Symmetry: C2
Amino acid sequence: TEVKIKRLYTGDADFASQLDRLLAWSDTDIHQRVTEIIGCIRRDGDAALVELTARFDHFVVDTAAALELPRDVLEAAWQALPAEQAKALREAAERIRAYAERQKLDSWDYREADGTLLGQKITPLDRVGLYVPGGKAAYPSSVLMNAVPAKVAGVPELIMAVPAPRGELNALVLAAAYISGVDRVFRIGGAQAVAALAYGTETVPRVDKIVGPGNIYVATAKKLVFGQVGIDMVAGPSEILVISDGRTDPDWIAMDLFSQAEHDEDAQAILISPDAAHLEAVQASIERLLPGMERAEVIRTSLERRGGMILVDDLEQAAAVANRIAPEHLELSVESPEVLVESIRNAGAIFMGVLPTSGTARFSSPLGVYDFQKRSSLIYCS
Amino acid sequence: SMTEVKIKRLYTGDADFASQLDRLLAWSDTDIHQRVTEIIGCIRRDGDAALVELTARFDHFVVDTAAALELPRDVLEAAWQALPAEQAKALREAAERIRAYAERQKLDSWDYREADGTLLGQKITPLDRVGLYVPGGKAAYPSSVLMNAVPAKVAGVPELIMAVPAPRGELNALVLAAAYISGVDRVFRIGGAQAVAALAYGTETVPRVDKIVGPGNIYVATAKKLVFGQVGIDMVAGPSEILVISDGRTDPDWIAMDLFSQAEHDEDAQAILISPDAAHLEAVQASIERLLPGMERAEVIRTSLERRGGMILVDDLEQAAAVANRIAPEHLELSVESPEVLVESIRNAGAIFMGVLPTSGTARFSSPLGVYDFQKRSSLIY
């Protein structure tokens, strides 16, 4: 029943190094394989894509044109969702759209003293490729959070790759692609899909940026085609950092940790508090509520491998430690978070009352509309 | 003839045109990768000791302690104060133009209320610390300092740290003066892979930064690639490129000089001319062959034109813009009668001239380096 979670104390002398080891996170054959696949796609295009799709996905088609899903299929997958899921999808997409609309970059210009016109010309990327994994194990959220900002940016051709293992489709994924304005959907995946998107085939249009997480083949391929296309940041496992003043119900804090611990065994969930009693209470809440979780084994694995509870002297030190951690997700479960947030510098998303992980929030932003736009300097000497 | 310059010629009517263009644009060590890995390891393992030693071995710059690697601020001020009045004037002016452009590009925090009352927002922060690499000796340009440092300081970066190696102690006055007026906070006489490692991981003497920018040799580029993840980096350069579109009204000598402007500073530079006027292309060839001998860097210009230069005949200006959009040049010049009309068809270009930039076709998906690259966004949810 016990869950052994690493406990750290800011008073300890070896604390910095312990925090380092807690945050630490880290094949030749895979690199070789992906290189070969990319080469095959560049050299032989569609024939290679069809063959590799039959090999990896067990999806057999006569011509590459058949890899594509008709648009009617997308609309129909949407039309057949249970009413509540449809509601949820529309609402989420709308929130994402509104937010993207507010972040959208605009063109402008101005005149220097001599009369020179200087300006910034904003354009959408010409085409964007979105990768989504096949089967039941994909989440519609990833589709919305990549595709919606891309369409708000004004990207004219948004192309999705999602493999169809043995022909199998994910209704929610297709419906999400439909309502987010995905333009074309191809049943391809893996390194072969990345290569097809990056270089083009006679069937697959060449895109300028590829986003969306996938397996080791997809990640490796994305790294190898960077330069030919832009890519999104490589995702590490999810992270949450909770700063708690001790006033919140420990059952709730526990659920806050489970929220991110539950979807990756290598996820990192950390709790910081100046209250030791509160930390013990949350330990208890974890051990009690854990069995009743459906993802109990994964949650346990994550908490035991990379979980942590850090006792700090106060909320100031909590903010300092957080700024060192630079977490993907930061939750300020404290009484005056609008005050505490003033001390926060490095965090992907902050919850008071796609995202950069593995400490890259020290220098990166979440994926947003701006990543599907670009600027050109304009100089008109008259 | 002895004066002739073999410049690659393409025509959009060619059946092989797409591939010919691909081959024209194309431009592409293991022992270096090993060495750099070892240097990074030594720096992580031995810190200041390793940095002092490696600086002694590689730069022949010998100091007793790592503290002695740093240049006092007094030195920067004195480098500025000893400049000829006109150089100082030019430096200040350039720095000011850059500053004014950066202020206009600066990202701002904001928030708004959803209908239900949920608060959504964007919190903008500057990067905590930024490292700027500048090559050593006389072969460095103050511009490289200004174009990184000024936008970083506009962004509000609290600690801007510069590495510039001092081979045999040698310094570049213009570089130091540029560091002075652009608000560089600290300057260290270190370079190569060891400087990148020192900045990325920190030593007792060198502060750990969150992003490293500034182009350098193969050791610096390799090191930057290897530390990406620990820090942000800038896009890798990237020999210069210029693409000129000419309708034929412009004096062909002027076009020739336009091509020369970028061809003359790198033998690997790419200068391409596009026109729907075949006679004009011939005229520019003649102007090139006539004007070339009188150029001071005639040898470099010729080498560049011969290796990567090109002239492309198109059907009309529509197609000129289409080809330009495929090329996606660093620099684009619209030498036509109505550039304010033609620019509407232009999508992919680092900078556009009518009347640090992305190169190698990355203008299809990248923006120039600017203030926004030294800022980051955090999502707020209340």
